[PDB]
From a paper:
The bifunctional l-fucokinase/GDP-β-l-fucose pyrophosphorylase (FKP) from Bacteroides fragilis catalyzes the conversion from l-fucose to GDP-β-l-fucose. The full-length FKP (FKP-FL, 949 amino acids) exists as a tetramer in solution, but the individually prepared N-terminal domain (FKP-NTD corresponding to the sequence 1–496, also containing a SUMO tag) and C-terminal domain (FKP-CTD, the sequence 519–949) form a monomer and a dimer, respectively. FKP-NTD has a single α/β domain and a β-helix-containing domain, whereas FKP-CTD folds into two α/β domains and the linker comprises three α-helices.
Meanwhile, a new monoclinic crystal form that contained the intact FKP-FL was obtained under a different condition. It required the presence of GTP, which would bind to and stabilize the N-terminal pyrophosphorylase part, in the crystallization solution. Using the FKP-NTD structure as the second search model, the complete crystal structure of FKP-FL was then determined also by molecular replacement, to a resolution of 2.3 Å. All missing loops in the structures of FKP-CTD and FKP-NTD, as well as the linker, were seen in both protomers, including an additional α-helix (816–827) in FKP-CTD. The linker turned out to contain three α-helices. Two GTP molecules were found in the FKP-NTD region of one protomer. The other protomer had one GTP and one GDP. The first GTP corresponds to the nucleotide substrate of the pyrophosphorylase. The second GTP (or GDP) binds to the same site for Hepes in SUMO-FKP-NTD.
Author numbering:
A (entry chain A), B (entry chain B): 0 to 949
Write the structure that this text describes.
Amino acid sequence: HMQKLLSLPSNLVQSFHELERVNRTDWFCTSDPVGKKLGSGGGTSWLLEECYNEYSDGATFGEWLEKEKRILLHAGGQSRRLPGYAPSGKILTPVPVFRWERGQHLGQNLLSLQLPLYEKIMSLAPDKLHTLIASGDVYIRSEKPLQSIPEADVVCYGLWVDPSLATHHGVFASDRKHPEQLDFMLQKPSLAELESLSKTHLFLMDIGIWLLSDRAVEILMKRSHKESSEELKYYDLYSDFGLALGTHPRIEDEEVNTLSVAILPLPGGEFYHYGTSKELISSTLSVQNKVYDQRRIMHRKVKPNPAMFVQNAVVRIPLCAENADLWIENSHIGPKWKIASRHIITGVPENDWSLAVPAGVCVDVVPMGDKGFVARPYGLDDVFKGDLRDSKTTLTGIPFGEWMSKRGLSYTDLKGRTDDLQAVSVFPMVNSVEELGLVLRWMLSEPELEEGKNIWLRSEHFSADEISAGANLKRLYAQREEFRKGNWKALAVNHEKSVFYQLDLADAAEDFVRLGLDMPELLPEDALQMSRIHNRMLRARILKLDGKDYRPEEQAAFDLLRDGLLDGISNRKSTPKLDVYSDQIVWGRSPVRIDMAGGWTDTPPYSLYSGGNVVNLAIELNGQPPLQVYVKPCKDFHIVLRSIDMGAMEIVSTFDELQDYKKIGSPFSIPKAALSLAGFAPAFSAVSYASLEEQLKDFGAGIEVTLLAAIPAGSGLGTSSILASTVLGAINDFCGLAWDKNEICQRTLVLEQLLTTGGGWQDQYGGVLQGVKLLQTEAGFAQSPLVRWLPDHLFTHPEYKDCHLLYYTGITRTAKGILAEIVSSMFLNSSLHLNLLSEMKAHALDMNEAIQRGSFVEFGRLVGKTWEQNKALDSGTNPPAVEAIIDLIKDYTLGYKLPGAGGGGYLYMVAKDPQAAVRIRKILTENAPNPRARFVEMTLSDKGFQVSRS
Amino acid sequence: HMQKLLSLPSNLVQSFHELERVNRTDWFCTSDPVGKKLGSGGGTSWLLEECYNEYSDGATFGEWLEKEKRILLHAGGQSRRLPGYAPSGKILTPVPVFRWERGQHLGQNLLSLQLPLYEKIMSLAPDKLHTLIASGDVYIRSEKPLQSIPEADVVCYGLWVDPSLATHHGVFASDRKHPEQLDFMLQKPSLAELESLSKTHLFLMDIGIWLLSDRAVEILMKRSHKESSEELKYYDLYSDFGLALGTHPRIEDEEVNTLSVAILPLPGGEFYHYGTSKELISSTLSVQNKVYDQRRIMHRKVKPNPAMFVQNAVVRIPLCAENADLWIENSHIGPKWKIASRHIITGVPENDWSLAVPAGVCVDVVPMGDKGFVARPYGLDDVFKGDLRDSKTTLTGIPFGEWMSKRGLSYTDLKGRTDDLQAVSVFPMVNSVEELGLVLRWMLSEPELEEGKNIWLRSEHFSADEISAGANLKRLYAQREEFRKGNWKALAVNHEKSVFYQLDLADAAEDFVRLGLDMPELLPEDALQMSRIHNRMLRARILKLDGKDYRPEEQAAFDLLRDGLLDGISNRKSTPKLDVYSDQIVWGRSPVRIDMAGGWTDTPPYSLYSGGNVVNLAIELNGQPPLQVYVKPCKDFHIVLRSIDMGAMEIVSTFDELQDYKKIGSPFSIPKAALSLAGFAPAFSAVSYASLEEQLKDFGAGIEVTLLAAIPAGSGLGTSSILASTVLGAINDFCGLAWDKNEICQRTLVLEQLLTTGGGWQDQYGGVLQGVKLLQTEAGFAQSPLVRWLPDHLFTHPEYKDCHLLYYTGITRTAKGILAEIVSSMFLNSSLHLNLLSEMKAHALDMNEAIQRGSFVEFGRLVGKTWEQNKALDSGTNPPAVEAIIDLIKDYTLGYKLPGAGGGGYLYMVAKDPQAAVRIRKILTENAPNPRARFVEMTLSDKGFQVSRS
Ligand SMILES: Nc1nc2c(ncn2[C@@H]2O[C@H](COP(=O)(O)OP(=O)(O)OP(=O)(O)O)[C@@H](O)[C@H]2O)c(=O)[nH]1
Ligand SMILES: Nc1nc2c(ncn2[C@@H]2O[C@H](COP(=O)(O)OP(=O)(O)OP(=O)(O)O)[C@@H](O)[C@H]2O)c(=O)[nH]1
Ligand SMILES: Nc1nc2c(ncn2[C@@H]2O[C@H](COP(=O)(O)OP(=O)(O)OP(=O)(O)O)[C@@H](O)[C@H]2O)c(=O)[nH]1
Ligand SMILES: Nc1nc2c(ncn2[C@@H]2O[C@H](COP(=O)(O)OP(=O)(O)O)[C@@H](O)[C@H]2O)c(=O)[nH]1
């Protein structure tokens, strides 16, 4: 597991692992020494020092830093501009579920949303960069493939967004002749400053993702201490260390300038700050406004305003269009509340207050002590900095002097600090919800309230620093959890309009079992089919986690899926007519396929969620099409089915026998379903016939179908789907149905839905259509792949053709059918699975690009990456014997993978060059893992499915 | 030229063609009959009836409606909420140049900005839709490719919008299970209705872009008249006709429901209101802040506030950050003015007034009569509706009763109507700028000024309706033109910070010549290179339009372009070494190319503006590579050059002779430049030599280069560039320079820059690289195409191969005039040319898609569309002889085009089928247009440039 190190507030360090439910093995956290601020760089150095002192197994710091890669997040500031989550350190702020996203956790926060990108970047990083540094108050997205990470001492990711937004952050400025290096950094530059440099420089806004080598770490830790030894000091990573980097740095440092700096634009990058109260709402609104298409929005709720976000809360007042810019979290809004706009309500316990909240002021309630509450009303624009007597120092939008004067208070009532509003003990700690409401009314729009002033005088006073230092986070998290327990039922009941069935339902089931909640009730038959499948699978998972019987629920979900996929599978009528002469035989034949990338993304229901991308190609094996079908007229008015590979024969005389797909011991389900779809079953026939015998008498003869699958099913080469398509095409030619290859593949999809195989669509398109292809579908039950052919240069040119090797290993899967687990995880919107499948889609697009550009090396590498993705999706795909075979020859390949679901069988290898291919052949021949392993010659098929007549 | 029909205010109809300088053939305008409103549908029927009565020519209404597609715009309301441009009908409102856009006209208005999208949609529409309907008070953008337009009776464009905004417009509601249909429309639905329909329906905001068939037009016009007679009536297209459409319409209508409705979401659509005074500022601010890319923003100037827009105006006071929401147009702001924020100043003549404008109040001055001015002060929030005695009836932010009382006035001074503020004659018409200023001061923040009241009492009074009805728009446009004449000089001087050199400089040159302005002075050498080229070409165009000598200015612009393209002349040095045996000969050969789509988009400087997209392929002619080069060692230490096609020979003995590219009568400039780039000229040689003879003595021998261009020059098949690349590749093999094909093409670009050809990069990549390719570059001087190969199925498969016909027309022509005209238009940011080139890029992408999908019919159709685009870009591309050749066989083709710049030469035809190809051959053989015309057999080249040794 990637190690996370966090610089947290002192109060949170002791409770982080319990409140966030994370183990101490993968998570280490500490704080700045109480009473001493260290800044960004100083806090990072202190975090590194603490983690080293914790796991110092006797090695020095230098050899310890190399031992593993680490992701360090600094969230140990004061959070002046975000008081609502200052005691949580910003990084633990709950983030609403995106109305366009599937598979998110209901209790997601900024940390859990932002961590995967950091882990991906670190796994892509070179091995000499053992330290990633980031701020936890941002949400960063990358919707395009990451570029190579250079081997510099400092690697900073940047993003050009808007000069107005760049005005508030760090900016990397690079000379127009050299965007590769960093010329200098700028901390919050003005619009005029960026304009004056626009003619000669490019600017990338600093998004707070830095990567440091051991040399840069040494220099930062030397700068974070004093002149002698261990004496710590304040040091800013971005304003002191940052401005000293680049070609022409603003700050001078002999050791910092020697560090090479590399600025990387984040591909498809998006940046959303979460450091101020205004940004808390604006960034969430932007993320919501990334998608507007209602066909891609699973949250079917009409909000009065898009900038209204309610999490872990109970709202007893009606919300209207005038209540814009609203953020309610971990709060209870009583029915007698009166609100306007621009509000941030956090931590408020249950109440029936008659509280009027003016526009622009926010209310925060922090649990303090065992039973007390600290009331912090503040302003959406309050910065909490500066001297109290300055007119610019504001509280709840009002200057602090005016706030004091209007309430009949004097500065003699504030004993303590007076030069910094952050350190002014002005927030009262009450011991009752009634006193809390009274003092909040007094501190807001009722300064004449007698009892409020009395309570404020009786109560102890806390500053924002003291609040963050003494907050009882256990009670805060417990209130949030009780609110979320109520919200689970609320969302499940309101499923037709809520985000319930687009959430990660595995996480939801875990939370249901942990909180002691009952399973959601069964959705009525009138509900959405997808929602019904989600509901049944969630109930099954809850029963499994509880220790009850879940098999019927699971099977019911699968049955709802198969019923859902039926489109024109009932009313698609054909009129088969004997289109050949009496002594003619129809021969159809098809090659198999190898999927290069994007496999699994065509599998329902994920393909229904977002559409699939698959790059694959048709291949003949040992110079022959492995799937073959013969169709001929029969003197008797019945259907004869013969199987060469199974060595069997069967006579179908009635409609009932033709549609008996699950007949015990029959290997003829595929041709039976194919003949049914061709119009020899009543449901698919345009003409009504009394019996199969009468239909065949009107037809002119019976039908004799002989089938050959020269490659057994489960080999991963697409045997079953391609055989179904071959039978369909032979019957198409024999019966004059005039189907084209695309319609044959679609009828194959329908056929496999008749047989309840539950697979995707990639195999039949890969085999029936010639050449190498990219296949893409959109979201929805209607899955009809758009086909884009690719150049076959990398597979047919003499310098490449002999580098594609196919090796039958003689090994079959030792593990069980994990496919069921994968499909059920898809039904539960499992976040890990959905993320991996999305990465597989993007990787299929990258494979398509590599093939288009004619890059053989990149093609082989991406094949290897597809193998890695498949191993990550299924642990049983790579048994140890296959891994030993791989290790025998891995040094001579650009990449390799198993075709299809894998688990053994065939190994596809892309040799580096023809000599490497000869070497691979020699090695695997002289070191056969078993007597059955053998090479199989594969050639790209320029024909696909072929059919001819005698 | 698609015909535009406009329903305008009555006063504007009489002067529209003169004020906007448009011909009466392509522009028709009328108004609703004065005294009766007809609504959207009634106004549409009246506009159609008027245009028919004008251009009937003896046809019936149906056969006239069929003749052509028409774009109808309704801009004929009262414009209560936009008084500053009410007499202009909103649609003629000047709109500031987008700071991120290139090629816009300085005098652009809303009409000129909105027309291109409508014309694009209409040209994409099926031929049965002859009528597009739109409102003139909106600005709509589409930044993603438009989808196919189905063939329905009514086609409506929509946009996914927040429900809160959808509450204020028409809404198309489609069942979630059938988004292809329209279920029903809703006119301004409430939030509760959207809640009730959100669970079962999708809603798209109506953006006001409808397309109607002739039957729908007939029904709309029957509904727009009464029942018995021809008397027109009010009829709403969206509330009456719209609510009667769909599957389950809200309103019942026997004839309207039979119309098929198709709802299309606008890809990448953006909607900007232009109906109220505040929206005038807000939508403009949004459009300005729409683009973020530093590479695409040429106007890099930060004003004190982003919401300050100044057009056609002189401002004598300084503008600061507090002057937000400011719109100054066609106005002179004297130095003694005092303004705040939220202002709209229009039509103010030159003055020295001491006028104080309070925040939120706007000033408008409308020329009236021969020399008079009507002063209309109003409020930014004034709606101009309601009875005068209501407190809500507002004027300049003040209730009208209070405004009357504060100036000692009574309702006995207002003769006329009193129930509608729009019809109250309260605005005085004065006869002098002095009286104008006095009465404006009186009507604003100086109600106690007696002289203002006296002038108001003596002067005639106009209502807003009377202003819009009697306004002297000629004087308004003349004042605007004088202001713009001043602004031209102001912008040209301030070129480093203005939008000057990103404007349409052809329009700018025309305006400079018309207004009698001198050309801008020469930019210093320290200015931006692109800006300097723009400056020189603009001076050249102004001199040419004036009748002076412009050739040196043009040549200087071309030289600045060539110098800008000079890149690696220093950091790409070669060391040629004799790499062949003494008796060995190197033979290089290349096929020609046919560009399928995107030609011209690779030509600088447009390729530098936005990058090029070109789909092209290599072809052999009559089974041979038409470009051939032989290189062999020479006993003498000189260079021998022989030309087979020119039948010539030349001896190069010195560096001076080798670099004499423009030698009189020499056809050897290409091989001389190629040998120079290979390292036989000192500037490109890594080793310094005293003379060419010494370099060749160290080399081991001289060089003998024989060239053959088997296809005559000017054929359009890429002969020159591909021959240059062939020489470069032959010399590369002969000298062991180890260049790859990409480097060969880049050296070809450098060679053509040495020879000052001024072309693009498409030809060399099309010829050197095998197969069919999409080539793409980004913006910037560095033009290095990314190459993506396409499947060659549509060109090599037997059912397609014989449909590609190449016919030498027997016409030759130096296509350098077409090149010069188009390149000079590119230098001037000619709006027509830039728009057409953008469409050519998009069309290249569509061609790439069609080839990927294997669609032969779509491929041929897109070839035809490429021919149409080329004809539209240059009128000289299709001479009448080529057009006559085309007309002989056009009925047997899916498409056709001339390769390259055209002007004659070869005709590429995509026959519908092999029989059609036989027919085309027969027709063109039996009817040869000239003794030289002949068919040439073309075959796709799977080799590209090849080189071998004897
Ligand atoms: N360990 C530690 N980290 C800090 C300290 N100050 C700031 N940081 C971190 O450095 C990053 C950048 O600083 P800021 O965004 O200004 O931190 P902040 O909490 O917003 O500070 P203020 O709002 O000014 O109170 C933040 O993510 C903080 O987590 C500090 O004193 N100690
Ligand atoms: N943590 C978290 N809680 C949420 C989120 N969305 C909603 N909630 C909580 O769940 C409760 C129920 O949500 P819904 O079923 O959508 O109800 P609502 O739309 O918020 O309001 P009503 O239906 O009118 O009661 C809300 O009151 C919120 O407190 C979310 O994205 N994240
Ligand atoms: N031909 C015609 N066009 C109209 C009519 N009414 C409105 N329009 C046009 O349709 C467009 C949309 O209507 P509105 O924006 O509400 O028209 P308007 O002139 O702004 O009306 P007010 O601002 O309320 O005075 C406007 O640009 C008008 O020019 C009409 O009765 N006949
Ligand atoms: N029509 C039109 N006029 C403009 C535009 N931008 C500027 N102008 C006018 O041109 C004059 C020159 O403006 P500019 O060179 O940018 O100077 P600046 O605006 O003071 O910085 C201004 O006084 C404006 O009145 C525009 O986009 N359209």
